[PDB]
Design a binder for this molecule. Structure first.
Ligand SMILES: [Ca+2]
Ligand SMILES: [Ca+2]
Ligand SMILES: [Zn+2]
Ligand SMILES: [Zn+2]
Lengths: 162, 5
């Protein structure tokens, strides 16, 4: 089933700040905002953790779209291959979640990768979930849904139950 | 992709 990260990195405060630093032309900004909020709450409802959106400066979870190299050692690779990636909880790059601008992202109303699904996966890694061996899990390593029992068991193992 | 760092 579920994986964490080695030595169970996790947010050490009850409040975790997040910021959407860069948007996609594929979607209205407010749509990315609402879907990120929905993704975070799918995890947050299970655990004693609150998310706070900020619109400036450096939040704990920095979220954004980028093409090619974007300041970490994991440059994006244009259309196809890698779609997105995210970092275990920690300072700086830890918690951050990046989406490749060279794909197409949808709110469900158009053609594209489902951004809610993808953001729930990435933000799982942003909270300290690794990949699951359970094909029903949002944290399964490969790409209308809910967290699986495995997803919920894993996140509650790391943070405890709300 | 989930990375450490
Ligand atoms: Ca961070
Ligand atoms: Ca790509
Ligand atoms: Zn990145
Ligand atoms: Zn992943």
């Amino acid at each position: 089933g579920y994986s964490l990260f080695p030595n169970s990195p996790k947010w050490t405060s009850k409040v975790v700040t997040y910021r959407i630093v860069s948007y996609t032309r594929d979607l209205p900004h407010i749509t990315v905002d609402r879907l990120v909020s929905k993704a975070l709450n799918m995890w947050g409802k299970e655990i004693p953790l609150h998310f706070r959106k900020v619109v400036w400066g450096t939040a704990d979870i920095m979220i954004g779209f980028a093409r090619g190299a974007h300041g970490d050692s994991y440059p994006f690779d244009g259309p196809g291959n890698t779609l997105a990636h995210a970092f275990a909880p920690g300072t700086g790059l830890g918690g951050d979640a990046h989406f490749d601008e060279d794909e197409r992202w949808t709110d469900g109303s158009s053609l594209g990768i489902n951004f809610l699904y993808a953001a729930t996966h990435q933000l799982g890694h942003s909270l300290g979930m690794g990949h699951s061996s359970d094909p029903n899990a949002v944290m399964y390593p490969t790409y209308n849904f809910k967290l699986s029992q495995d997803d919920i068991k894993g996140i509650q193992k790391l943070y405890g139950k709300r | 992709x989930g990375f450490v760092x």
